């Protein structure tokens, strides 16, 4: 119960979301095409704004959003195994649109 | 009284002490002292217990005190290792368990057939610093039912007897008590395990209700103390626990607990011994007797 | 392991103790100066009170509260927070100015709307006239303090040296001077109006006093808290001694058996 | 020793040095002889050999062998088997300490951790037990008082509180007794003070006849009578 | 500016005198900021 | 009686006459003075008890005679011999500051305090 | 020098240092190296004792440094376990005690009838992490009188020697000592004790007294850094310690302590090496010597 400045709390805050992002329940594996997006959102700090309790709401809903709309994008990441400049910009637009939750 | 591993000097002190207290004419003392070699100490509870059983199958009650079963374990340890048997957990043999369980179940209350005989037991343990991670203490505990956990810390801090009641339990040992001795102590066992929790956080919440419990509880702990080697009579103990259970230690402050006690007893017999004749013979309190005591205790509390 | 892990922890518990011990001494050092000032501060404050007595008193409300930036001073931060919360319930529209970071965080959750002025870097500094003066001058423009007929400051009064009791007191306003029926005994002309000068000056002189008392109960509280930490920390020390002792006995025992099992075959 | 008691009727006080080396010497004998070491690497013959020794030491019906022993533990450990066995035969502890000797008070015997299992109303006299406890409780409360007196400061005392401190520090000096052996170093003849006169003295501090007698005159005295002369001497 | 600001400068001025002590210099010395607030919402803190 | 108090030190008075300079000219108090409220300007203050005189250098404050013979004096500074030349140098820097820019108000207090100092 | 469990390279270093500083022509290194079989290593302190003993017996003197006895213990383990003696504590032989105890009894100052001679000793023990709850350290510790306890933390911090003064103890103390050096280091023992307690108070705000202790204290510790492989004579120990005690280092900044020492000595040696010669030979200090010495220290600090 140390007093924490803003520089320290950027780390602590960033981390807590990441920890929750890691979080998984038992018996629900997923394919690589659909773990490449989720990791972009955590590392590139799209969850920093999103509340800690609802990271898990967001993970699931984001995945339903992409299945309808950006299913072309996911097939490309699966088939080619790399995200291009074009794939990176597309992925970044997708996270953004859904960054409200 | 089986004295295993104790000093021959202590035992001679103990033999004389009992003859002053005129109690040696209905007790035996068995000896396998520290001086006397280990295989005799091993056999000491067994041999004595045969003597105990003889009273028990004549259909009469008895008692045997095994001091100290931790020293039977040592006696048996030395004999066991010199015979080439490799040490178990905590460097004591793994057949230690066998000795204590066989030994202990020859003290048991029998049925109507056997003359409703009994041989009771109080097995006395040498603990390795209040640890119960150790093998020998747990082995005696798992065979037995009930514990009389006793504290060194408490003994030093003027509680004689220093019988902690937090890690002391009774399982099937709780149907011993006749009705007077169920009424009077009623739920005191429970109240002073609400007192323990109240004092963990009295290093959260501070309320009259919690404070009131803590004051009753301390006062109650003081009350438990009694002089050693003149044990206060049972009939005499029945009024004193009533008072405290019925919360009447909100008028007595801690310093005066001892003073009240003797003055309250003297008062009760001279005023009304009727109450005490009843408890000597009946050994069961009725509501009317109970009320009569409450009425008398409050009278004494004021003045 | 067991063996190593017990030991590693005993080194942490020692460092925790040693550091809590360390603070208790610097806290004491600071406390001697905190009191010395405080006495002097209290003496200025009476000179105002004396006046207010013979004057008779006719005092929306402001709340200022005073703690520090630095944490681990005890329940000083949250007990003062709660005593602010009573008078934000006698009027659920009262305005909270928070002097210090610690008190700020807790109040900010309960009512996000109210915080208008707040002051930092006062917690790591002692109460000094320069700071109270600048806080006072700003108080007038932002909060329109003189318009209010009652202003209140809260602090923790160090009644006795193991205790602190949260307390409040009332700072006067320009209205009080005006309508008291014994502003008549005291004499001045229209040349100076005692309302525009005396309110401003006693906003600060009262404020400084609360600031020294609040701080003194806070450094005092911290000393007590840190003393209580050593008693608890010792008990943890003694427990880990027994843990180390049990562990040693098992390591020796188990090693023998293995050597023996080897000799035996 | 056994020959002096049984055949000349005389008391004998028999010292033993480290009993840590008694246990150590047996473990090796055991090991070489083809016995197997027990708990904590120690001799499987630890309890029985010690028991025989200490039932050879007792009050006979002619004379007595009493023994004062020196107890040294295996690297600060009281859960080990060898101290435990020892402690059973012991009926008192005299606990000598460095903190007491730094105040230039020899005897070194730490009052609080000096305890007996024969110090009681029924053994030493009721009076004796009670004098001994009051003097103990007083040092015990003094010690606790000092603890918070350092942190807060020393202006905090009331009239009552300082009464415990004064009586304690009078005893604290009063502890030191010139020792005969150590006669040169003190420069003051060693004194002896019998059991009855030990009780009486401490009673006098309890009735406060010696609660105004100078604090630096309790340094290296004997009986109750003796320190009247030192008191005159500090003052004069 | 307030009457107490005016006096605060005046005390600071009086020690500018030839004699002084540790607490005087401190009594006039501030390395303190203040955080502006309105409504949670904040414009940026600025030297006090 | 008469009081002196400061943030950092407390002064305890008895006193017969107290002599004061206030924003109404100059005020004198001798025995019981009929109650007056004047805030004290930057001042040189004298206190006399009997034929003894004692002197103080005061930074301004407030003064209040209460009816019972008690002169409550508070100031942020306010001894006279103790206070004691660099203020002339401070005046030159204040003149520089004004050219660009409170700085006006600060240099006005310095000139006010400098006239008052010259009286000593 | 008793090279027990030390490589041939390790002793090649010792040899080269010893020759550079001319100490070869009284020095002996009895060598039982680490490759050299476990019986030779076991017998290496025992052999070396003999080489010393021959000097001691004839009335003469010597000092034998057993380095490291820790390794003697491993060697015995090999021997003991193959010949099948069961080990006691920590799988280190049960009579390992007996081994170390027998060796260290030779290290004492003989009577006038033996022709006055001695074998001095300075045993060395290596600890894994500083653990002295182990079998091999605990036995030695008891057997020996004196200990020097080097602290890993002190070493890093550039303090070589890395002696931790609290756990460094002498058990025969100042019986044998030069008086002059004793006098000006009574003060040093108490100063240094004090400085320790107030170094954990400064992990910020402090009182004037404690803050004095700290500055004055630091100067004393900085004097106790003595460069490795640089001998010092009694005529040069006494002055330095005296400066610090009497507070002439208080002024001297830390960067300047190292230079201070050397420069001061040479100044005393030119001006008056009589006083220095008197210290050496008398082994004592006088009211007359102290006046001049103190006066000389004051003049020197001032420039």
From Swiss-Prot, chain A:
Compartment(s): Mitochondrion inner membrane
Domain of life: Eukaryota
Protein function: Mitochondrial membrane ATP synthase (F(1)F(0) ATP synthase or Complex V) produces ATP from ADP in the presence of a proton gradient across the membrane which is generated by electron transport complexes of the respiratory chain. F-type ATPases consist of two structural domains, F(1) - containing the extramembraneous catalytic core, and F(0) - containing the membrane proton channel, linked together by a central stalk and a peripheral stalk. During catalysis, ATP synthesis in the catalytic domain of F(1) is coupled via a rotary mechanism of the central stalk subunits to proton translocation.
Protein family according to the UniProt entry: Belongs to the ATPase alpha/beta chains family.
Subunit structure: F-type ATPases have 2 components, CF(1) - the catalytic core - and CF(0) - the membrane proton channel. CF(1) has five subunits: alpha(3), beta(3), gamma(1), delta(1), epsilon(1). CF(0) has three main subunits: a, b and c.
Other remarks in the entry: Present with 41500 molecules/cell in log phase SD medium.
Protein name per UniProt: ATP synthase subunit alpha, mitochondrial
Organism of provenance: Saccharomyces cerevisiae (strain ATCC 204508 / S288c)
Full-protein interval shown: 444 to 544 of 545
Curated annotation (Swiss-Prot), chain C:
Lineage: superkingdom: Eukaryota
Keyword Transport attributed: yes
GO molecular-function term, one example from the UniProt record: proton-transporting ATP synthase activity, rotational mechanism
GO terms (BP aspect): proton motive force-driven ATP synthesis
Result when mutating residue 229 to V: Lower activity
Alphabetically ordered keywords of this record: ATP synthesis, CF(1), Hydrogen ion transport, Ion transport, Membrane, Mitochondrion, Mitochondrion inner membrane, Transit peptide, Transport
Residue ranges the record marks as coiled coil: none
Effect ascribed to mutating residue 259 to T: In ATP3-1; dominant suppressor of the slow-growth phenotype of yme1 strains lacking mitochondrial DNA
This protein's record includes keyword Mitochondrion: yes
Mutagenesis / variant outcome for changing residue 253 to A: In ATP3-5; dominant suppressor of the slow-growth phenotype of yme1 strains lacking mitochondrial DNA
Topology of this chain in the membrane: Peripheral membrane protein
One cellular component (GO) term of this entry: mitochondrion
InterPro entries cross-referenced by the UniProt entry: ATP_synth_F1_ATPase_gsu, ATP_synth_F1_gsu, ATP_synth_F1_gsu_CS
Span of the signal peptide: none
Cellular localization per UniProt: Mitochondrion; Mitochondrion inner membrane
Complex and partners: F-type ATPases have 2 components, CF(1) - the catalytic core - and CF(0) - the membrane proton channel. CF(1) has five subunits: alpha(3), beta(3), gamma(1), delta(1), epsilon(1). CF(0) has three main subunits: a, b and c.
Other notes: Present with 28100 molecules/cell in log phase SD medium.
Record family assignment: Belongs to the ATPase gamma chain family.
Annotated protein name in UniProt: ATP synthase subunit gamma, mitochondrial
UniProtKB/Swiss-Prot annotation, chain D:
Modified sites of kind Phosphoserine: 101
Subcellular location: Mitochondrion; Mitochondrion inner membrane
Tree of life domain: Eukaryota
Note: Present with 164000 molecules/cell in log phase SD medium.
Protein task: Mitochondrial membrane ATP synthase (F(1)F(0) ATP synthase or Complex V) produces ATP from ADP in the presence of a proton gradient across the membrane which is generated by electron transport complexes of the respiratory chain. F-type ATPases consist of two structural domains, F(1) - containing the extramembraneous catalytic core, and F(0) - containing the membrane proton channel, linked together by a central stalk and a peripheral stalk. During catalysis, ATP synthesis in the catalytic domain of F(1) is coupled via a rotary mechanism of the central stalk subunits to proton translocation.
Subunit structure: F-type ATPases have 2 components, CF(1) - the catalytic core - and CF(0) - the membrane proton channel. CF(1) has five subunits: alpha(3), beta(3), gamma(1), delta(1), epsilon(1). CF(0) has three main subunits: a, b and c.
Family: Belongs to the ATPase alpha/beta chains family.
Stated name of the protein: ATP synthase subunit beta, mitochondrial
Source organism of the structure: Saccharomyces cerevisiae (strain ATCC 204508 / S288c)
Curated annotation (Swiss-Prot), chain E:
Record's GO cellular component terms: mitochondrial inner membrane; mitochondrion; proton-transporting ATP synthase complex
InterPro entries, alphabetized: ATP_synth_F1_esu_mt, ATP_synth_F1_esu_sf_mt
The entry's keywords: ATP synthesis, CF(1), Hydrogen ion transport, Ion transport, Membrane, Mitochondrion, Mitochondrion inner membrane, Phosphoprotein, Transport
Cell compartment(s), UniProt: Mitochondrion; Mitochondrion inner membrane
UniProt cross-references to CDD domains, sorted A to Z: F1-ATPase_epsilon
UniProt superkingdom: Eukaryota
GO MF annotation list: proton-transporting ATP synthase activity, rotational mechanism
One Pfam family, short name: ATP-synt_Eps
Gene Ontology process terms (BP): proton motive force-driven ATP synthesis; proton motive force-driven mitochondrial ATP synthesis
Chief place of localization: mitochondrion
Subunit and partners: F-type ATPases have 2 components, CF(1) - the catalytic core - and CF(0) - the membrane proton channel. CF(1) has five subunits: alpha(3), beta(3), gamma(1), delta(1), epsilon(1). CF(0) has three main subunits: a, b and c.
Similarity section: Belongs to the eukaryotic ATPase epsilon family.
Additional note from the record: Present with 4280 molecules/cell in log phase SD medium.
Name this protein carries in UniProt: ATP synthase subunit epsilon, mitochondrial
Organism this protein belongs to: Saccharomyces cerevisiae (strain ATCC 204508 / S288c)
